[PDB]
């Protein structure tokens, strides 16, 4: 019975009993994230910004089945293309704008990556991606307003796939947590 978030602490209760389970329903954490209302003063503990690039901040570690973290980009600040390492991924937006930009999985032949598409993800969306619909880059096209988001994946993985657009050619990039629970963690 799926009820509004009220915070996000209420949210993160509801998360670990919707994965109470071994399937995950996408619709219905997609609609619970998107109800949570943004409070930026209940998120403000992880929302730690690096100058030069985003930083990723582990808010909840789940039941063993998922992670919740919030992703803080200044302006100008962007992802590479990549995966999701077979895993379900939901990003919200907390505050901001970010663009989305999907790519198809390239062919073993080396050739440009062409974007099949591209948003806008505004304040409290959010969306969802996996594997099965393909790659994508995140960016923070605004000159003048960080963005934050709130991510969460199932299974966790600390490991993806960063693809050169030039070429579609893959490499593996070990993802790290610039904070855990409110604590830098260099
Ligand atoms: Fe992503």
Same mark, same amino acid.
């Not at 973290?69 to 919200?92: A, V």
């Not at 959010?126 to 994946?153: F, M, Q």
């Given at each position: ?14 998360? @670990? &009993?919707?994965?109470?389970?071994? &399937?995950?329903? !996408? &619709?219905?954490?997609?609609? !619970?994230?998107? %109800?949570?209302? +943004? ?5 403000? $503990?992880? %929302? ?31 992802? +590479? ?17 970010? *663009?989305? =930009? $999907?790519?198809?999985?390239? /062919?073993? *032949?080396? #050739?440009?990556?062409? *974007?099949?598409? &591209? ?7 959010? %969306?969802?991606?996996? /594997?099965?619909?393909?790659? @994508?880059? !995140?960016? #923070? ?12 994946? +199932? ?6 796939? %960063? ?5 579609? @050619? *893959? #490499?593996?990039? =070990?993802? =790290?947590? @610039? ?8």
């Amino acid at each position: 019975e799926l009820l509004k978030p009220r915070t996000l602490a209420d949210l993160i209760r509801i998360l @670990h &009993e919707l994965f109470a389970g071994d &399937e995950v329903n !996408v &619709e219905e954490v997609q609609a !619970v994230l998107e %109800a949570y209302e +943004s409070n930026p003063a209940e998120w403000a $503990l992880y %929302a730690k910004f690096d100058q030069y690039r985003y930083t990723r901040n582990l808010v909840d570690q789940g039941n063993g089945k998922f992670n919740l973290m919030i992703l803080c980009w200044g302006e100008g600040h962007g992802s +590479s293309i990549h995966d999701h390492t077979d895993s379900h991924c939901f990003l919200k937006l907390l505050q901001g704008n970010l *663009k989305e =930009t $999907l790519f198809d999985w390239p /062919d073993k *032949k080396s #050739n440009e990556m062409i *974007k099949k598409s &591209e948003r806008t993800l505004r304040e409290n969306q959010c %969306a969802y991606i996996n /594997d099965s619909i393909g790659l @994508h880059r !995140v960016e #923070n096209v605004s000159h003048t307003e960080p963005a934050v988001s709130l991510h969460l994946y +199932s299974p966790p993985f600390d490991t993806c796939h %960063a693809f050169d657009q030039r070429t579609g @050619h *893959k #490499n593996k990039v =070990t993802m =790290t947590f @610039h904070s855990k629970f409110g604590i830098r963690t260099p």
